[PDB]
Amino acid sequence: VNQSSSVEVSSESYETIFSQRIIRDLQKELVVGALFEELPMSSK
Amino acid sequence: VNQSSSVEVSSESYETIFSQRIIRDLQKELVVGALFEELPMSSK
């Protein structure tokens, strides 16, 4: 799609480097779940 | 109960692990019972 040059590439796939960094946003942190303690129940 | 599988416990009492732990709340602090001294009386 850069058609400026006479000999332009077929797709934009060939004009792009697909890095595979899997970036992520700040994701809501979690507090409520771990604060408390467990009663290892072993029965229903 | 927990009747999901062939083979089930009979009463759900054979399920629950009854505990014998007893718990009492924060329970009103008794401030004025002992603040003051005693006159050990021996008559009305």
Curated annotation (Swiss-Prot), chains A, B:
Source domain of life = Viruses
How does the annotation summarize its subunit structure? Interacts with the decoration protein; each hexon binds a single copy of the decoration protein. Interacts with the portal protein.
Primary role: Major capsid protein that self-associates to form 120 hexamers and 11 pentamers, building the T=13 icosahedral capsid which about 860 Angstroms in diameter. Responsible for its self-assembly into a procapsid. The phage does not need to encode a separate scaffolfing protein because its capsid protein contains the delta domain that carries that function. The capsid gains its final stability through the reorganization of the subunits that takes place upon expansion. DNA encapsidation through the portal triggers capsid expansion and the binding of the decoration protein to the capsid exterior.
Please identify the protein, giving its name as recorded: Major capsid protein
Summarize which stretch of the complete protein this chain spans.
Answer: 161 to 204 of 458
Q: Where in the cell is it found?
A: Virion
